[PDB]
Amino acid sequence: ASLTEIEHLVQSVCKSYRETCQLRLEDLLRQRSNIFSREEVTGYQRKSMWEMWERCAHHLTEAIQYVVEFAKRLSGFMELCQNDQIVLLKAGAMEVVLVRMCRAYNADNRTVFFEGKYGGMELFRALGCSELISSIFDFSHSLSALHFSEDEIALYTALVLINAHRPGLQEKRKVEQLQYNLELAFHHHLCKTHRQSILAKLPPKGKLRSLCSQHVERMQIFQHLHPIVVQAAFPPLYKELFSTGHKIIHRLLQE
Numbered sequence: 001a002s003l004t005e006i007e008h009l010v011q012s013v014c015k016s017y018r019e020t021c022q023l024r025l026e027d028l029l030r031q032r033s034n035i036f037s038r039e040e041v042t043g044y045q046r047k048s049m050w051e052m053w054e055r056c057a058h059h060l061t062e063a064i065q066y067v068v069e070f071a072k073r074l075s076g077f078m079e080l081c082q083n084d085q086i087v088l089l090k091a092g093a094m095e096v097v098l099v100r101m102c103r104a105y106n107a108d109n110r111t112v113f114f115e116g117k118y119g120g121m122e123l124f125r126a127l128g129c130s131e132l133i134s135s136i137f138d139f140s141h142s143l144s145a146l147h148f149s150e151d152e153i154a155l156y157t158a159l160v161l162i163n164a165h166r167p168g169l170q171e172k173r174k175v176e177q178l179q180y181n182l183e184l185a186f187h188h189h190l191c192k193t194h195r196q197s198i199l200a201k202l203p204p205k206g207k208l209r210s211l212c213s214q215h216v217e218r219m220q221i222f223q224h225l226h227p228i229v230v231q232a233a234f235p236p237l238y239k240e241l242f243s244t245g246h247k248i249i250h251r252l253l254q255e
Protein backbone atom coordinates (compact mmCIF):
# COMPACT_ATOMS: atom_id res chain seq x y z
CA ALA A 1 0.00 0.00 0.00
CA SER A 2 0.94 3.64 -0.64
CA LEU A 3 0.04 6.54 1.65
CA THR A 4 -3.27 7.59 0.10
CA GLU A 5 -4.60 4.01 0.31
CA ILE A 6 -3.58 3.75 3.98
CA GLU A 7 -5.61 6.88 4.71
CA HIS A 8 -8.46 5.28 2.77
CA LEU A 9 -8.09 2.20 4.96
CA VAL A 10 -8.26 4.41 8.05
CA GLN A 11 -11.64 5.81 6.97
CA SER A 12 -12.92 2.36 5.93
CA VAL A 13 -12.15 0.87 9.37
CA CYS A 14 -13.54 3.83 11.30
CA LYS A 15 -16.77 3.63 9.31
CA SER A 16 -17.05 -0.16 9.65
CA TYR A 17 -16.69 0.24 13.41
CA ARG A 18 -19.15 3.16 13.55
CA GLU A 19 -21.81 1.05 11.78
CA THR A 20 -21.28 -1.87 14.17
CA CYS A 21 -21.18 -0.37 17.66
CA GLN A 22 -23.71 -1.86 20.03
CA LEU A 23 -24.54 1.72 21.06
CA ARG A 24 -23.33 5.15 20.04
CA LEU A 25 -20.89 6.67 22.53
CA GLU A 26 -23.38 9.53 23.09
CA ASP A 27 -26.04 7.08 24.28
CA LEU A 28 -23.57 5.60 26.77
CA LEU A 29 -22.54 9.01 28.14
CA ARG A 30 -26.09 10.48 28.25
CA GLN A 31 -26.93 7.66 30.70
CA ARG A 32 -24.15 8.22 33.22
CA SER A 33 -26.35 9.80 35.88
CA ASN A 34 -28.79 6.87 35.53
CA ILE A 35 -27.37 4.66 38.27
CA PHE A 36 -28.85 1.62 40.01
CA SER A 37 -30.24 2.45 43.43
CA ARG A 38 -29.04 0.61 46.52
CA GLU A 39 -32.17 -1.57 46.30
CA GLU A 40 -31.67 -2.55 42.67
CA VAL A 41 -28.11 -3.56 43.54
CA THR A 42 -29.38 -5.76 46.37
CA GLY A 43 -31.80 -7.24 43.85
CA TYR A 44 -28.91 -8.12 41.56
CA GLN A 45 -26.99 -9.64 44.47
CA ARG A 46 -29.95 -11.72 45.68
CA LYS A 47 -30.39 -13.24 42.22
CA SER A 48 -29.25 -16.83 41.83
CA MET A 49 -25.83 -17.54 40.35
CA TRP A 50 -27.31 -19.30 37.31
CA GLU A 51 -29.77 -16.53 36.46
CA MET A 52 -27.01 -13.91 36.67
CA TRP A 53 -24.77 -16.05 34.46
CA GLU A 54 -27.59 -16.42 31.94
CA ARG A 55 -28.22 -12.66 31.88
CA CYS A 56 -24.51 -11.91 31.43
CA ALA A 57 -24.13 -14.65 28.80
CA HIS A 58 -27.11 -13.15 26.96
CA HIS A 59 -25.57 -9.69 27.20
CA LEU A 60 -22.21 -10.95 25.89
CA THR A 61 -23.86 -12.70 22.94
CA GLU A 62 -25.41 -9.42 21.76
CA ALA A 63 -22.05 -7.64 22.05
CA ILE A 64 -20.31 -10.49 20.21
CA GLN A 65 -22.87 -10.33 17.39
CA TYR A 66 -22.00 -6.70 16.71
CA VAL A 67 -18.32 -7.74 16.63
CA VAL A 68 -19.14 -10.36 13.97
CA GLU A 69 -20.81 -7.63 11.89
CA PHE A 70 -17.72 -5.45 12.44
CA ALA A 71 -15.63 -8.33 11.05
CA LYS A 72 -17.99 -8.79 8.09
CA ARG A 73 -17.69 -5.06 7.34
CA LEU A 74 -13.93 -4.92 7.90
CA SER A 75 -11.88 -4.39 4.74
CA GLY A 76 -10.25 -7.66 3.69
CA PHE A 77 -11.84 -9.97 6.27
CA MET A 78 -14.48 -11.48 3.96
CA GLU A 79 -11.66 -12.21 1.48
CA LEU A 80 -10.01 -14.61 3.92
CA CYS A 81 -11.06 -18.23 3.64
CA GLN A 82 -13.94 -19.26 5.88
CA ASN A 83 -11.64 -21.33 8.11
CA ASP A 84 -9.51 -18.30 9.00
CA GLN A 85 -12.62 -16.11 9.30
CA ILE A 86 -13.83 -18.48 12.02
CA VAL A 87 -10.42 -18.95 13.65
CA LEU A 88 -10.07 -15.18 13.93
CA LEU A 89 -13.57 -14.72 15.39
CA LYS A 90 -13.27 -17.63 17.81
CA ALA A 91 -10.11 -16.17 19.35
CA GLY A 92 -10.68 -12.44 18.89
CA ALA A 93 -14.40 -11.86 19.39
CA MET A 94 -14.37 -11.82 23.20
CA GLU A 95 -11.21 -9.69 23.06
CA VAL A 96 -12.80 -6.99 20.90
CA VAL A 97 -15.80 -7.08 23.27
CA LEU A 98 -13.39 -6.67 26.20
CA VAL A 99 -11.80 -3.63 24.54
CA ARG A 100 -15.23 -2.26 23.59
CA MET A 101 -16.38 -2.53 27.21
CA CYS A 102 -14.41 0.57 28.16
CA ARG A 103 -16.82 2.87 26.31
CA ALA A 104 -19.53 1.78 28.79
CA TYR A 105 -17.16 2.23 31.73
CA ASN A 106 -17.33 5.38 33.90
CA ALA A 107 -13.97 5.93 35.58
CA ASP A 108 -15.20 8.68 37.94
CA ASN A 109 -17.46 6.37 39.97
CA ARG A 110 -16.16 3.02 38.62
CA THR A 111 -19.56 1.94 37.27
CA VAL A 112 -20.51 0.11 34.08
CA PHE A 113 -23.62 0.20 31.92
CA PHE A 114 -25.64 -2.99 32.39
CA GLU A 115 -29.31 -3.51 31.50
CA GLY A 116 -30.26 0.14 31.28
CA LYS A 117 -28.30 1.77 34.13
CA TYR A 118 -24.82 2.08 35.65
CA GLY A 119 -23.58 0.04 38.59
CA GLY A 120 -20.26 -0.89 40.15
CA MET A 121 -18.78 -4.36 40.27
CA GLU A 122 -20.79 -5.27 43.37
CA LEU A 123 -23.67 -5.73 40.90
CA PHE A 124 -22.09 -9.00 39.75
CA ARG A 125 -21.29 -10.65 43.10
CA ALA A 126 -23.85 -13.40 42.42
CA LEU A 127 -21.66 -14.70 39.57
CA GLY A 128 -19.15 -16.04 42.08
CA CYS A 129 -16.17 -15.02 39.93
CA SER A 130 -15.04 -11.87 41.71
CA GLU A 131 -11.45 -12.15 40.47
CA LEU A 132 -12.49 -12.06 36.82
CA ILE A 133 -14.91 -9.19 37.49
CA SER A 134 -12.18 -7.17 39.21
CA SER A 135 -9.79 -7.82 36.32
CA ILE A 136 -12.32 -6.69 33.72
CA PHE A 137 -13.08 -3.56 35.72
CA ASP A 138 -9.37 -2.81 36.14
CA PHE A 139 -8.67 -3.56 32.48
CA SER A 140 -11.51 -1.21 31.58
CA HIS A 141 -10.05 1.32 34.03
CA SER A 142 -6.67 1.14 32.27
CA LEU A 143 -8.17 1.58 28.81
CA SER A 144 -10.18 4.58 29.98
CA ALA A 145 -7.05 6.28 31.31
CA LEU A 146 -5.86 6.46 27.69
CA HIS A 147 -8.89 8.50 26.52
CA PHE A 148 -9.37 6.55 23.30
CA SER A 149 -11.21 8.29 20.53
CA GLU A 150 -13.81 6.25 18.70
CA ASP A 151 -11.48 6.19 15.68
CA GLU A 152 -8.66 4.78 17.81
CA ILE A 153 -10.86 2.04 19.28
CA ALA A 154 -11.93 1.26 15.71
CA LEU A 155 -8.35 0.83 14.52
CA TYR A 156 -7.16 -0.98 17.66
CA THR A 157 -10.00 -3.53 17.72
CA ALA A 158 -9.42 -4.20 14.02
CA LEU A 159 -5.88 -5.27 14.91
CA VAL A 160 -7.13 -7.21 17.94
CA LEU A 161 -9.27 -9.26 15.57
CA ILE A 162 -6.88 -9.55 12.57
CA ASN A 163 -4.11 -11.37 14.44
CA ALA A 164 -1.90 -13.42 12.14
CA HIS A 165 -0.44 -15.39 15.06
CA ARG A 166 -3.71 -17.17 15.88
CA PRO A 167 -3.08 -20.95 15.86
CA GLY A 168 -4.99 -22.71 13.11
CA LEU A 169 -4.78 -20.19 10.28
CA GLN A 170 -4.53 -21.83 6.86
CA GLU A 171 -3.64 -18.69 4.88
CA LYS A 172 -1.28 -17.24 7.49
CA ARG A 173 0.52 -14.98 5.01
CA LYS A 174 -2.70 -13.44 3.70
CA VAL A 175 -3.74 -12.57 7.27
CA GLU A 176 -0.28 -11.05 7.97
CA GLN A 177 -0.62 -8.76 4.96
CA LEU A 178 -4.06 -7.57 6.10
CA GLN A 179 -2.67 -7.23 9.64
CA TYR A 180 0.25 -5.16 8.33
CA ASN A 181 -2.05 -2.81 6.42
CA LEU A 182 -4.28 -2.32 9.46
CA GLU A 183 -1.19 -1.68 11.61
CA LEU A 184 0.03 0.87 9.06
CA ALA A 185 -3.45 2.41 9.16
CA PHE A 186 -3.48 2.53 12.98
CA HIS A 187 0.01 3.96 13.33
CA HIS A 188 -0.53 6.48 10.52
CA HIS A 189 -3.61 7.85 12.27
CA LEU A 190 -1.77 7.99 15.61
CA CYS A 191 1.12 9.86 13.98
CA LYS A 192 -1.21 12.27 12.19
CA THR A 193 -3.06 13.08 15.42
CA HIS A 194 0.05 13.14 17.67
CA ARG A 195 -1.07 10.12 19.70
CA GLN A 196 1.86 7.69 19.27
CA SER A 197 2.45 8.10 23.01
CA ILE A 198 -0.39 5.60 23.63
CA LEU A 199 1.51 2.83 21.80
CA ALA A 200 3.60 2.12 24.91
CA LYS A 201 0.45 2.24 27.07
CA LEU A 202 -1.68 -0.28 25.17
CA PRO A 203 -2.27 -3.55 27.07
CA PRO A 204 0.04 -6.45 26.22
CA LYS A 205 -1.53 -9.17 24.11
CA GLY A 206 -1.11 -11.60 27.02
CA LYS A 207 -3.49 -9.48 29.10
CA LEU A 208 -6.38 -9.77 26.61
CA ARG A 209 -5.72 -13.50 26.30
CA SER A 210 -5.57 -13.79 30.10
CA LEU A 211 -9.02 -12.20 30.50
CA CYS A 212 -10.50 -14.54 27.88
CA SER A 213 -9.08 -17.75 29.28
CA GLN A 214 -10.29 -16.73 32.76
CA HIS A 215 -13.72 -16.26 31.23
CA VAL A 216 -13.60 -19.77 29.78
CA GLU A 217 -12.28 -21.18 33.08
CA ARG A 218 -14.86 -19.67 35.45
CA MET A 219 -17.55 -20.62 32.99
CA GLN A 220 -16.41 -24.21 32.84
CA ILE A 221 -16.57 -24.24 36.63
CA PHE A 222 -20.12 -22.83 36.50
CA GLN A 223 -21.22 -25.22 33.73
CA HIS A 224 -19.93 -28.19 35.72
CA LEU A 225 -22.17 -27.11 38.64
CA HIS A 226 -25.19 -26.31 36.42
CA PRO A 227 -24.94 -28.34 33.21
CA ILE A 228 -28.62 -28.17 32.22
CA VAL A 229 -28.74 -24.38 32.66
CA VAL A 230 -26.05 -23.90 30.01
CA GLN A 231 -27.71 -26.51 27.81
CA ALA A 232 -31.18 -25.04 28.30
CA ALA A 233 -30.79 -21.28 28.78
CA PHE A 234 -27.49 -20.06 27.37
CA PRO A 235 -27.53 -18.53 23.86
CA PRO A 236 -26.29 -20.99 21.22
CA LEU A 237 -23.61 -18.60 19.94
CA TYR A 238 -22.19 -18.26 23.46
CA LYS A 239 -21.99 -22.03 24.01
CA GLU A 240 -20.31 -22.57 20.62
CA LEU A 241 -17.59 -20.00 21.34
CA PHE A 242 -16.85 -20.95 24.92
CA SER A 243 -18.27 -24.02 26.71
CA THR A 244 -16.96 -27.55 27.29
CA GLY A 245 -20.20 -29.32 26.40
CA HIS A 246 -18.38 -22.71 13.92
CA LYS A 247 -21.98 -23.09 12.63
CA ILE A 248 -23.93 -20.18 14.08
CA ILE A 249 -20.78 -18.25 13.17
CA HIS A 250 -21.02 -19.94 9.76
CA ARG A 251 -24.54 -18.56 9.24
CA LEU A 252 -23.82 -15.15 10.78
CA LEU A 253 -20.98 -14.88 8.23
CA GLN A 254 -22.99 -16.19 5.25
CA GLU A 255 -25.94 -13.80 5.82
Ligand SMILES: Cc1c(CN2CCN(C(=O)C3CCCC3)[C@@H](C)C2)cc(F)cc1NC(=O)c1cccc(C#N)c1
Residues within 6 Å of the ligand: 021, 022, 023, 024, 028, 056, 057, 059, 060, 100, 101, 102, 103, 104, 105, 112, 113, 114, 115, 124, 127, 129, 132, 133, 136, 137, 140, 215, 218
Ligand atom coordinates in the same frame (compact mmCIF):
# COMPACT_ATOMS: atom_id res chain seq x y z
C1 LIG B 1 -21.58 -5.14 31.86
C2 LIG B 1 -20.26 -4.46 31.73
C3 LIG B 1 -19.24 -4.81 32.58
C4 LIG B 1 -19.45 -5.86 33.62
N1 LIG B 1 -19.14 -7.21 33.13
C5 LIG B 1 -19.59 -8.22 34.11
C6 LIG B 1 -20.23 -9.38 33.39
N2 LIG B 1 -19.45 -9.70 32.24
C7 LIG B 1 -18.71 -10.85 32.18
O1 LIG B 1 -17.90 -11.11 31.30
C8 LIG B 1 -19.00 -11.78 33.32
C9 LIG B 1 -17.71 -12.50 33.64
C10 LIG B 1 -17.84 -13.93 33.20
C11 LIG B 1 -19.29 -14.17 32.83
C12 LIG B 1 -19.98 -12.82 32.82
C13 LIG B 1 -19.29 -8.70 31.22
C14 LIG B 1 -20.23 -8.97 30.06
C15 LIG B 1 -19.65 -7.34 31.75
C16 LIG B 1 -18.01 -4.19 32.49
C17 LIG B 1 -17.81 -3.22 31.54
F1 LIG B 1 -16.60 -2.60 31.45
C18 LIG B 1 -18.83 -2.86 30.69
C19 LIG B 1 -20.06 -3.47 30.78
N3 LIG B 1 -21.10 -3.10 29.91
C20 LIG B 1 -20.80 -2.83 28.60
O2 LIG B 1 -19.70 -2.86 28.08
C21 LIG B 1 -21.94 -2.45 27.77
C22 LIG B 1 -23.23 -2.70 28.19
C23 LIG B 1 -24.27 -2.34 27.37
C24 LIG B 1 -24.03 -1.74 26.16
C25 LIG B 1 -22.74 -1.49 25.75
C26 LIG B 1 -22.49 -0.86 24.49
N4 LIG B 1 -22.27 -0.33 23.48
C27 LIG B 1 -21.69 -1.85 26.56
